[PDB]
Amino acid sequence: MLSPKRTRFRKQHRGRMKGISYRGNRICFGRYALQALEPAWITSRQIEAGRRAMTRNARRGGKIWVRIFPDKPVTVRPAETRMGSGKGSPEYWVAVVKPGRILYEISGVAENIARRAVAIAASKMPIRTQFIISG
Amino acid sequence: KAKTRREDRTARHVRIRKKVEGTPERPRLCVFRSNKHLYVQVIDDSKMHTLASASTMQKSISEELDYSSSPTIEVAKKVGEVIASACLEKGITKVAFDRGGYPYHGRVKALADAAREKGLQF
Amino acid sequence: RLKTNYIEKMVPLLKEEFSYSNILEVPKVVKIVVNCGIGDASQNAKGLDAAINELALITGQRPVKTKAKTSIAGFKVREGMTLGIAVTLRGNLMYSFLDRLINLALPRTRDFQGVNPNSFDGHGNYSVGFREQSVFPEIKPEIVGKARGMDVCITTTAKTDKEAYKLLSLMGMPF
Amino acid sequence: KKELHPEFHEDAKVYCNGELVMTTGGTKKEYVVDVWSGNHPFYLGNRSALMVDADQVEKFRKRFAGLSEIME
RNA sequence: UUCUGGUGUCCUAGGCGUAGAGGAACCACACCAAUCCAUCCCGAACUUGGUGGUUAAACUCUACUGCGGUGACGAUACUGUAGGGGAGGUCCUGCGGAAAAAUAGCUCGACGCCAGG
RNA sequence: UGGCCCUCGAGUGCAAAGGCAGAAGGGAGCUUGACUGCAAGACCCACCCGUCGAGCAGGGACGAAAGUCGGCCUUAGUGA
């Protein structure tokens, strides 16, 4: 649930994944889609390894769309005790992937080719994913 | 295209003031002049109603020249006196000074002064 | 002459050319702001006084003392310094002054074409400009700093642009 | 005192014409050929490009057309 | 009853845009301006004395549902209390309350005191 | 400079929140309550302490007048 961002004064608290309330999108772009079931801290090394894989089995075809964006920073403690708050960029950054929201979107292709494409993309995701269609 | 909010004229001429609001509504004195005549009114307060309302034309009925000038300052004091007197007889002098747009010596300088001739004093 | 010509030839044609109706509601000049900016950047009070006492002759009216609007530019200009003047005449003082530029002053200027580009603002308003080589019955090239021009923005009561040039063309303004 | 009399100059206001004898008030060539006028800028001649497109119109007459050598 | 002016109770079902239309009985433009007064530059705006013309603009109405706004029923989210599950760190159940968004629809206000036709 | 769209998206002495165009915004004249002596009724603290405040008494300033002002938009700029 991340995408290329730009430099800024990014450095705030962590946050807290709440009820499914917020997330609850549908299927706008692309024919089929893929949703989640439980919130989490998706890093950039996960979305990138999942996006390229989505087109890795395609190569020169349709177009990929991302209706998501990270926000909630991620501070980690080196190895010492706890004197203050973490940095926020040691490893990476994440957000919140609550269920009901849409993630990947594929279209302009067949049903089978667009089916296996989401398969591998789902493996890259740490949280379980639900496969849908339309309607 | 895009709705724009602009404060009306009667919202920048410093019409409504503080203090006087000691009462639900201060006994203002509607002393406005049109583009030919002038209308005076001792509007009450609370909700509405007034004590006495006179005009430049109404005076012509009592005793005034027919095709006589109105914008003239001479008529100002005449319009301020006709509205007065009877206004006091209605009960008791309940008029204040309210006017936003007349540089002191405006066509209302005689209207307010006329009130000081019937009893209203401040 | 300029004012009189208005209600005896100017307005008439403005009644037949455009929509037929009453007498008024026709293109009529309201004022004439012949602003004469001064060379900015250079901090000098001489150029300021040389301007105020410059237009106060051709218009016979004490100029203005505009102040630099509060803003952040590239130059080292501050807010609170005077760098321009704009006088505007009305009534008789307007028509009379406007009649000057039309009759006199021009084509007094050597090599005066007259062909004006597009221009127009978009609401019945017209403006012109004079190079650093003009001439006016009031201006005296005997006791002045340096030859400097000025801007002349004439606004009318016209609703549209097509009703702007139609008021200055039949008036006498060079076109 | 220069600030005393603001100088109205009403004379030049109402009487803009006055006397053309003093200063030429549009007596010269406001907009007309001066003398000889021999100016040929880029805006003259080059602007109004005289179109020159001539072709062969079909006529009613017996004439053999075609060069000695044929070529596409 | 219709129209018009000043001041309120109510402040974007009452706002904005567009089109049409009315009055020199009322209101605005407008005429004049040596003055009281004003414009650090112009009486543009205030202001003062007032033929004529107009009511185009402005303003006050009417029509027209583009743009705003007002706003159900049902469902959903959340939650108090009393309990039960549970690997995503939340969720479910009995019960009470139950909006935001969105949909049908409503809608381009309605009146009060006084004065002048 | 002139015209149009001109709608806290500007300006507030300085951080920031809130608030403000009936303006403390901005400009000018007169002035200078950036008043003395008190002060019903309350807020804020364990206490000390802090804050707001109609009106009254003795005298002034501004406006025609009603009328305002006991500091500076408010909250720090301090210490028995």
XYZ file of C-alpha atoms (C1' of nucleotides) in Angstrom:
701
model
C 0.000 0.000 0.000
C 2.732 2.446 -1.008
C 3.873 4.540 -3.971
C 6.702 6.929 -4.983
C 6.489 10.072 -2.845
C 8.392 13.358 -2.609
C 10.702 15.021 -0.079
C 9.034 16.856 2.810
C 9.081 17.531 6.554
C 7.763 14.018 7.188
C 8.347 13.010 10.814
C 5.332 12.428 13.065
C 3.934 9.855 15.498
C 3.170 6.228 14.661
C -0.605 5.972 14.802
C -2.931 3.010 15.286
C -4.935 0.847 12.888
C -8.569 1.215 13.943
C -11.775 -0.539 12.930
C -12.605 -1.446 9.338
C -14.749 1.704 9.424
C -12.470 3.857 7.254
C -11.427 1.451 4.494
C -14.325 0.224 2.385
C -13.589 1.117 -1.229
C -14.905 -0.750 -4.268
C -13.820 -1.555 -7.825
C -13.467 1.551 -9.993
C -10.347 1.201 -12.140
C -9.540 -2.105 -13.804
C -11.834 -5.094 -14.278
C -10.904 -7.265 -11.296
C -9.353 -6.216 -7.985
C -7.862 -7.355 -4.676
C -8.742 -6.394 -1.099
C -7.361 -7.104 2.374
C -8.861 -8.539 5.561
C -6.794 -7.095 8.416
C -4.848 -3.805 8.810
C -1.045 -3.781 9.027
C 2.215 -1.891 8.498
C 2.970 -2.409 4.801
C 6.492 -1.268 3.924
C 7.712 0.033 0.561
C 9.784 -3.107 0.001
C 6.492 -5.010 -0.124
C 4.466 -2.915 -2.569
C 7.395 -2.672 -4.986
C 8.059 -6.411 -4.818
C 4.364 -6.925 -5.479
C 3.841 -4.403 -8.270
C 6.751 -5.532 -10.442
C 5.589 -9.111 -9.893
C 2.114 -8.131 -11.089
C 3.596 -7.243 -14.478
C 6.515 -9.673 -14.248
C 4.298 -12.436 -15.631
C 2.899 -10.047 -18.240
C 5.619 -7.783 -19.645
C 4.360 -5.143 -22.080
C 0.589 -5.193 -21.709
C -1.998 -3.219 -19.779
C -1.487 -0.571 -17.106
C -1.163 -0.779 -13.321
C -3.017 1.606 -11.009
C -2.476 2.362 -7.322
C -5.403 3.680 -5.279
C -3.318 3.616 -2.100
C -0.693 5.726 -0.326
C 1.453 5.352 2.839
C 1.559 7.889 5.676
C 2.134 6.580 9.206
C 5.944 6.695 9.671
C 7.953 3.881 11.264
C 10.485 4.468 14.042
C 12.699 1.608 15.221
C 15.104 1.319 18.154
C 18.735 0.493 17.213
C 19.929 -1.792 20.014
C 20.315 0.470 23.047
C 17.703 1.122 25.734
C 14.971 3.753 25.357
C 16.085 7.363 25.808
C 13.832 8.937 23.197
C 11.652 8.333 20.147
C 12.940 6.498 17.093
C 14.163 8.137 13.894
C 11.453 7.203 11.414
C 13.611 6.227 8.451
C 15.965 3.471 9.687
C 14.171 0.705 7.790
C 11.285 2.338 5.895
C 7.725 3.647 6.226
C 4.207 2.193 6.121
C 0.494 2.950 6.486
C -2.737 1.070 7.224
C -4.396 -1.572 5.047
C -7.812 -2.093 6.630
C -10.270 -4.554 5.019
C -12.943 -3.398 2.592
C -10.506 -1.223 0.655
C -9.248 -2.026 -2.844
C -5.556 -2.538 -3.616
C -4.359 -3.714 -7.033
C -6.316 -3.316 -10.273
C -5.929 -5.102 -13.612
C -7.726 -4.620 -16.932
C -7.304 -4.590 -20.699
C -6.473 -8.292 -20.566
C -8.190 -11.682 -20.370
C -9.716 -13.159 -17.214
C -7.117 -15.898 -16.751
C -4.056 -13.718 -17.347
C -5.554 -11.183 -14.938
C -6.258 -13.954 -12.430
C -2.784 -15.449 -12.021
C -1.312 -11.942 -12.050
C -3.032 -11.100 -8.763
C -2.015 -14.492 -7.369
C 1.714 -13.769 -7.136
C 0.926 -10.197 -6.087
C -1.028 -11.638 -3.159
C 1.961 -13.727 -2.077
C 4.060 -10.578 -1.693
C 1.452 -9.190 0.701
C 2.033 -10.118 4.379
C -1.690 -9.912 5.134
C -4.262 -12.308 3.681
C -5.971 -11.061 0.521
C -9.460 -11.561 -0.904
C -10.025 -11.992 -4.641
C -13.037 -10.287 -6.221
C -14.352 -9.300 -9.651
C -16.973 -6.574 -10.158
C -20.638 -5.724 -9.692
C -18.891 30.620 -11.254
C -17.832 31.089 -7.632
C -20.112 32.625 -5.003
C -18.497 35.650 -3.359
C -19.572 37.285 -0.096
C -19.455 41.085 0.039
C -20.450 43.082 3.118
C -23.336 45.372 2.168
C -23.054 49.145 2.565
C -25.228 49.239 5.689
C -22.663 46.826 7.131
C -19.552 48.996 6.825
C -20.851 52.498 7.572
C -20.624 51.608 11.266
C -24.405 51.458 11.652
C -24.897 49.172 14.651
C -22.859 50.140 17.715
C -22.168 48.507 21.087
C -23.032 50.333 24.338
C -26.463 51.545 23.195
C -27.356 47.848 23.124
C -27.797 48.117 26.884
C -31.446 47.724 25.940
C -32.759 45.105 23.476
C -32.755 47.941 20.933
C -31.716 51.590 21.176
C -34.283 54.264 20.179
C -32.547 55.210 16.929
C -33.733 58.058 14.707
C -34.193 57.150 11.041
C -32.955 60.356 9.411
C -32.360 59.342 5.794
C -32.723 61.579 2.739
C -33.765 60.270 -0.675
C -32.744 61.747 -4.029
C -35.348 64.509 -3.780
C -36.967 64.455 -0.334
C -36.105 63.398 3.219
C -37.917 60.943 5.490
C -37.646 60.994 9.285
C -38.807 58.324 11.732
C -38.532 57.795 15.488
C -38.744 54.001 15.240
C -39.220 52.429 18.672
C -37.518 49.182 19.703
C -38.314 45.809 21.299
C -39.913 44.340 18.170
C -41.182 47.204 16.009
C -43.688 50.075 15.971
C -42.812 53.774 16.153
C -43.897 56.914 18.010
C -44.335 59.319 15.095
C -43.310 59.372 11.433
C -43.238 62.547 9.339
C -42.068 63.468 5.839
C -41.317 66.487 3.652
C -44.532 65.941 1.695
C -46.748 65.437 4.748
C -45.685 68.881 5.965
C -46.997 70.419 2.738
C -50.466 69.502 4.012
C -50.229 71.387 7.310
C -48.817 74.678 6.023
C -46.152 74.817 3.311
C -45.679 76.174 -0.212
C -46.796 73.740 -2.919
C -43.891 73.665 -5.378
C -41.457 74.495 -2.572
C -37.929 73.079 -2.485
C -37.297 70.119 -0.180
C -33.538 69.361 -0.323
C -33.080 72.822 1.199
C -31.744 72.824 4.761
C -34.671 75.062 5.712
C -36.961 72.071 5.182
C -34.693 69.802 7.230
C -35.518 71.550 10.506
C -39.152 71.620 9.382
C -39.210 67.851 8.876
C -37.495 67.356 12.219
C -40.032 69.472 14.092
C -43.178 68.065 12.480
C -42.134 64.550 13.486
C -41.406 65.878 16.971
C -43.897 67.438 19.394
C -46.613 64.875 18.661
C -43.938 62.235 19.240
C -43.558 63.493 22.807
C -47.328 63.709 23.266
C -47.395 59.996 22.445
C -45.753 59.424 25.813
C -42.248 60.723 26.479
C -39.176 61.686 24.438
C -37.655 58.364 23.369
C -35.318 59.327 20.527
C -31.547 58.991 20.159
C -28.899 59.987 17.618
C -28.281 57.449 14.855
C -26.849 58.284 11.435
C -24.130 56.675 9.342
C -23.302 58.474 6.120
C -23.771 62.155 6.925
C -20.510 64.045 7.693
C -21.895 65.764 10.802
C -23.218 68.846 8.992
C -25.223 66.510 6.774
C -28.858 67.124 5.848
C -29.541 65.629 9.276
C -27.755 68.289 11.328
C -31.063 70.156 11.471
C -33.080 66.978 12.010
C -31.234 66.178 15.236
C -31.210 69.831 16.291
C -34.965 70.074 15.739
C -35.382 67.391 18.403
C -33.564 69.638 20.877
C -36.320 72.205 20.347
C -39.236 70.024 21.446
C -37.679 68.527 24.563
C -35.147 65.854 23.620
C -31.879 66.920 25.253
C -28.508 65.188 25.609
C -15.995 71.904 -28.072
C -14.983 68.415 -26.947
C -17.857 68.179 -24.467
C -20.309 69.892 -26.817
C -19.357 67.625 -29.723
C -20.403 64.732 -27.486
C -24.124 65.536 -27.524
C -24.324 66.566 -31.187
C -22.402 63.898 -33.102
C -20.749 61.459 -30.696
C -23.880 60.184 -28.942
C -26.044 60.314 -32.113
C -23.937 57.812 -34.063
C -23.717 55.726 -30.886
C -27.506 55.432 -31.018
C -27.773 54.169 -34.596
C -24.671 51.962 -34.699
C -25.674 50.151 -31.508
C -29.074 49.092 -30.171
C -31.785 51.745 -30.465
C -33.096 52.938 -27.099
C -33.032 56.076 -24.941
C -30.386 58.811 -24.961
C -28.011 57.804 -22.163
C -26.576 54.315 -21.572
C -24.051 55.257 -24.256
C -20.226 55.111 -24.042
C -19.100 58.076 -21.942
C -15.682 58.778 -20.430
C -15.709 58.981 -16.631
C -12.082 59.934 -15.985
C -8.595 60.092 -17.496
C -5.690 58.764 -15.432
C -2.467 59.836 -17.145
C -0.129 58.102 -14.691
C 3.576 58.808 -15.173
C 5.696 56.191 -13.434
C 9.257 57.024 -12.415
C 12.449 55.007 -12.784
C 12.279 52.595 -9.856
C 15.269 50.954 -8.158
C 17.247 54.205 -8.100
C 16.523 55.766 -4.708
C 16.277 59.480 -5.494
C 13.860 62.127 -4.223
C 14.725 64.354 -7.183
C 12.945 62.118 -9.671
C 9.925 62.077 -7.372
C 9.614 65.863 -7.186
C 10.474 66.104 -10.883
C 7.337 64.052 -11.529
C 4.844 65.654 -9.145
C 5.816 69.045 -10.579
C 5.632 67.582 -14.084
C 2.047 66.413 -14.594
C 0.767 69.213 -12.358
C 1.211 71.403 -15.437
C -0.426 69.495 -18.293
C -3.373 68.655 -16.039
C -3.032 71.520 -13.582
C -3.714 69.163 -10.686
C -1.422 68.057 -7.852
C -0.317 64.434 -8.520
C -0.600 61.509 -6.099
C 1.912 59.829 -3.783
C 1.387 56.102 -4.343
C 3.284 53.727 -2.057
C 4.999 50.451 -2.948
C 2.521 47.666 -2.191
C 3.632 45.228 0.508
C 5.163 42.247 -1.291
C 8.290 40.099 -1.575
C 10.087 40.585 -4.891
C 13.600 39.848 -6.111
C 15.032 43.356 -5.889
C 15.925 45.044 -2.600
C 12.862 47.295 -2.757
C 11.095 48.130 0.506
C 7.522 49.123 1.356
C 6.795 52.783 2.025
C 8.676 54.476 -0.807
C 6.958 56.590 -3.462
C 7.701 55.606 -7.060
C 4.874 56.935 -9.208
C 2.004 59.370 -9.710
C -1.417 59.142 -11.359
C -3.668 62.158 -11.900
C -7.275 61.854 -13.063
C -9.535 64.666 -14.267
C -13.338 64.716 -14.330
C -16.129 66.906 -15.665
C -15.016 69.883 -17.742
C -11.412 69.400 -16.627
C -11.647 65.982 -18.279
C -13.180 66.800 -21.665
C -10.963 69.881 -21.926
C -7.759 67.968 -21.187
C -8.843 65.110 -23.450
C -9.417 67.592 -26.273
C -5.788 68.696 -25.991
C -4.087 65.404 -26.856
C -6.552 65.055 -29.733
C -6.169 68.497 -31.309
C -2.819 69.776 -30.040
C 0.231 67.799 -28.893
C -0.459 65.486 -31.838
C 0.577 64.874 -34.482
C 3.002 67.481 -33.128
C 5.346 64.641 -32.180
C 7.840 64.067 -34.994
C 7.291 60.803 -36.872
C 3.870 59.922 -35.460
C 2.413 56.827 -37.125
C -0.911 56.393 -35.357
C -1.383 52.669 -35.930
C -2.278 51.080 -32.592
C -2.085 47.308 -31.909
C -4.743 45.157 -30.235
C -4.825 46.706 -26.755
C -8.179 46.789 -24.941
C -8.744 45.449 -21.427
C -12.054 43.649 -21.828
C -14.660 45.983 -20.344
C -15.157 49.155 -22.366
C -11.785 50.601 -21.376
C -8.862 51.851 -23.463
C -5.275 52.813 -22.635
C -2.283 54.248 -24.496
C 1.391 55.005 -23.950
C 3.871 57.700 -24.950
C 7.585 57.127 -25.538
C 10.333 59.209 -23.932
C 9.805 61.788 -26.685
C 6.456 63.553 -26.322
C 5.293 67.172 -26.448
C 2.682 69.212 -24.577
C 1.836 72.958 -24.530
C 2.506 72.812 -20.785
C 5.728 70.791 -20.893
C 8.860 72.940 -21.106
C 11.995 71.275 -22.564
C 14.048 74.131 -21.111
C 14.060 73.339 -17.390
C 13.649 69.579 -16.960
C 15.767 66.593 -15.979
C 15.511 64.122 -18.850
C 12.970 63.366 -21.578
C 10.487 60.917 -20.062
C 7.154 59.571 -21.267
C 3.949 58.637 -19.459
C 0.901 56.360 -19.583
C -2.662 57.446 -20.358
C -5.475 55.147 -19.234
C -8.879 56.469 -20.298
C -11.841 54.567 -18.857
C -15.445 54.979 -20.004
C -18.902 53.775 -18.975
C -18.891 51.339 -21.896
C -20.044 47.797 -21.125
C -18.069 45.974 -23.816
C -14.850 46.654 -25.735
C -16.581 47.173 -29.087
C -18.203 50.206 -27.456
C -14.848 51.657 -26.406
C -13.078 52.433 -29.680
C -16.406 53.565 -31.132
C -16.394 56.408 -28.606
C -12.798 57.513 -29.167
C -12.769 57.049 -32.944
C -15.685 59.382 -33.670
C -14.343 61.625 -30.907
C -11.043 62.539 -32.530
C -8.480 60.209 -30.971
C -5.848 59.038 -33.514
C -6.627 55.594 -34.945
C 5.660 80.410 -3.795
C 5.293 77.657 -6.394
C 2.705 75.891 -4.237
C 0.671 79.103 -4.136
C -0.982 79.044 -7.561
C -1.658 75.430 -8.679
C -1.958 76.729 -12.248
C -5.307 75.697 -13.729
C -4.380 76.610 -17.305
C -8.080 76.718 -18.179
C -7.093 78.592 -21.339
C -5.314 75.547 -22.761
C -8.114 73.362 -21.396
C -11.145 74.793 -23.194
C -9.151 76.439 -25.993
C -6.987 73.544 -27.177
C -6.856 74.908 -30.724
C -5.771 78.430 -29.841
C -3.303 79.692 -32.434
C -1.647 77.171 -34.749
C 0.762 79.974 -35.648
C 2.751 79.403 -32.456
C 3.170 75.634 -32.749
C 2.123 73.335 -35.592
C -0.985 71.571 -34.330
C -1.359 69.002 -37.081
C -0.639 71.153 -40.124
C 2.117 68.916 -41.494
C 1.574 65.348 -42.695
C -0.502 63.713 -39.959
C -1.081 60.752 -42.273
C -0.238 61.398 -45.926
C 2.604 60.966 -48.424
C 5.276 63.516 -47.517
C 7.712 64.006 -50.404
C 8.925 61.356 -52.860
C 8.880 58.776 -50.051
C 11.450 56.135 -50.941
C 11.224 53.656 -48.073
C 11.155 49.925 -48.819
C 11.190 48.044 -45.474
C 10.476 44.359 -44.845
C 6.828 45.195 -44.161
C 6.492 46.538 -47.704
C 6.565 44.217 -50.701
C 7.569 41.166 -48.677
C 4.277 41.299 -46.776
C 1.855 41.384 -49.708
C 3.346 38.410 -51.552
C 1.982 38.705 -55.089
C 0.658 35.206 -55.782
C 1.938 33.800 -59.077
C 0.292 30.530 -60.110
C -0.029 29.931 -63.853
C -1.219 26.734 -65.534
C -2.274 25.346 -68.915
C -5.981 25.561 -69.740
C -7.618 23.132 -72.169
C -8.355 24.744 -75.535
C -10.160 23.633 -78.692
C -7.389 23.207 -81.263
C -5.445 20.443 -83.013
C -1.900 20.555 -81.635
C 0.586 17.760 -80.942
C 1.840 17.979 -77.358
C 4.815 16.018 -76.068
C 8.600 16.303 -75.986
C 10.932 14.144 -78.078
C 12.020 12.183 -75.005
C 9.470 10.632 -72.647
C 10.049 10.496 -68.889
C 8.002 10.069 -65.712
C -55.327 43.959 -2.392
C -51.003 45.686 -5.992
C -46.442 48.752 -6.060
C -42.388 51.589 -3.470
C -38.876 53.518 0.684
C -36.479 53.076 5.794
C -35.822 49.891 10.014
C -36.423 44.374 12.318
C -37.964 39.169 13.829
C -35.394 34.908 10.895
C -29.208 34.725 8.577
C -26.702 30.497 1.623
C -35.878 25.660 1.530
C -33.946 32.529 1.995
C -26.849 32.310 -2.290
C -24.955 32.942 -7.155
C -25.413 32.839 -12.581
C -28.757 33.697 -16.837
C -33.224 35.978 -19.275
C -37.259 39.335 -19.159
C -39.631 43.431 -17.109
C -41.213 48.320 -14.095
C -41.637 53.493 -11.854
C -39.678 61.173 -13.176
C -46.704 58.692 -7.486
C -41.893 56.514 -4.829
C -36.398 55.102 -5.285
C -31.479 55.243 -8.335
C -28.552 57.510 -12.458
C -28.272 62.231 -13.742
C -27.849 68.477 -13.939
C -24.959 72.294 -11.429
C -21.302 73.371 -8.025
C -18.045 81.029 -6.237
C -19.878 78.379 -1.119
C -20.789 75.099 4.677
C -17.951 70.250 3.827
C -14.911 66.616 1.280
C -10.885 64.603 -2.283
C -2.823 63.140 1.253
C -4.813 63.136 -6.728
C -9.869 64.106 -9.232
C -16.730 66.911 -5.450
C -15.651 59.088 -8.605
C -17.304 58.475 -3.563
C -19.322 62.133 0.672
C -21.409 67.013 0.323
C -24.619 71.519 -1.327
C -28.145 74.124 -4.726
C -31.516 72.031 -8.313
C -34.207 72.642 -15.239
C -33.962 68.626 -18.352
C -33.406 63.365 -19.838
C -33.325 58.523 -18.291
C -34.667 54.354 -15.107
C -29.152 51.383 -19.383
C -26.438 50.292 -14.952
C -27.714 49.820 -9.676
C -31.965 48.379 -6.946
C -36.805 46.174 -6.466
C -40.015 42.007 -8.851
C -41.095 37.807 -12.431
C -39.468 33.487 -15.260
C -35.803 29.865 -15.996
C -34.616 23.873 -11.362
C -26.367 25.057 -14.610
C -23.610 25.892 -10.077
C -24.537 25.880 -4.126
C -27.738 24.742 -0.260
C -31.984 22.273 2.704
C -32.972 17.131 3.559
C -36.272 11.517 4.496
C -37.314 5.880 4.841
C -33.841 1.694 4.951
C -28.913 0.050 5.590
C -24.030 0.848 7.513
C -20.128 2.916 11.150
C -19.561 3.946 16.195
C -21.114 3.396 21.289
C -23.375 3.007 27.020
C -24.761 -1.277 29.986
C -24.730 -6.629 30.688
C -21.957 -11.183 28.496
C -19.514 -14.414 25.138
C -15.127 -15.487 21.392
C -10.446 -14.333 19.743
C -3.823 -15.326 15.415
C -3.543 -9.821 12.925
C -4.294 -7.356 17.469
C -9.577 -6.330 16.344
C -14.379 -8.480 16.393
C -19.338 -10.879 17.644
C -24.085 -11.263 20.513
C -28.815 -9.363 23.782
C -30.426 -4.342 24.486
C -30.737 1.395 24.110
C -29.038 5.306 21.204
C -27.810 5.601 16.147
C -25.184 10.509 12.754
C -21.488 11.676 8.159
C -21.617 10.372 2.902
C -25.202 8.969 -0.568
C -30.521 8.323 -2.802
C -36.002 9.839 -3.675
C -37.755 14.316 -2.696
C -38.097 19.623 -1.148
C -36.523 24.232 -2.998
C -34.811 29.680 -6.592
C -38.193 32.201 1.372
C -41.862 33.550 4.211
C -43.544 37.745 7.424
C -43.906 42.150 11.142
C -44.340 48.225 12.277
C -44.769 52.801 9.706
C -45.082 56.185 5.467
C -45.910 57.591 0.274
C -49.051 56.231 -4.752
C -1.853 53.017 -13.559
C -7.073 51.584 -15.418
C -10.997 47.608 -15.820
C -12.748 42.650 -14.774
C -12.726 37.881 -11.454
C -11.942 40.077 -6.331
C -14.778 34.576 -1.922
C -11.376 34.057 7.130
C -7.028 30.925 0.808
C -4.680 38.835 3.326
C -3.390 41.780 7.075
C -2.752 40.995 12.860
C 4.928 43.993 16.292
C 7.430 38.529 17.422
C 5.964 31.370 18.307
C 1.315 29.076 18.075
C -4.191 28.019 18.747
C -8.560 30.544 18.505
C -10.871 34.832 16.903
C -11.654 39.317 13.630
C -13.704 42.765 7.541
C -20.709 45.581 13.433
C -13.145 44.976 12.569
C -8.049 45.342 17.511
C -7.079 45.391 9.872
C -5.282 50.343 7.562
C -4.827 55.931 7.429
C -5.540 60.892 9.543
C -6.856 64.991 13.209
C -7.459 65.890 18.071
C -5.029 63.739 22.015
C -2.108 60.720 25.529
C -7.704 56.437 31.650
C -0.223 53.321 29.245
C -6.565 57.968 35.846
C -6.402 58.437 41.550
C -9.314 56.384 45.516
C -12.745 51.993 45.798
C -15.353 48.210 43.871
C -21.295 43.996 44.179
C -20.521 39.302 42.216
C -16.904 35.134 40.504
C -12.890 32.216 38.017
C -8.031 29.961 38.863
C -4.483 27.365 43.166
C -3.000 22.916 48.990
C -1.307 27.725 50.088
C 1.142 32.047 48.235
C -0.217 33.850 44.056
C -2.777 34.850 39.250
C -7.137 36.746 36.114
C -11.783 39.313 34.835
C -15.163 42.798 36.251
C -20.780 46.483 35.787
C -21.178 50.346 38.868
C -19.673 54.453 42.576
C -16.494 59.059 44.204
C -12.828 63.063 42.675
C -11.115 65.376 37.661
C -10.185 65.197 32.017
C -9.845 63.720 26.373
C -12.596 62.734 21.659
C -17.553 63.264 18.946
C -23.129 67.110 17.431
C -24.611 63.509 20.615
C -25.318 58.610 22.571
C -20.733 57.106 24.215
C -15.596 55.005 24.794
C -10.782 54.622 27.390
C -8.111 52.331 34.224
C -2.403 50.252 28.214
C -0.827 47.275 23.897
C -6.605 41.042 19.529
C -5.839 37.441 23.923
C -2.353 34.033 26.169
C 4.532 34.520 27.912
C 8.087 39.084 27.913
C 8.928 36.932 35.019
C 10.609 35.907 40.542
C 8.652 36.540 47.131
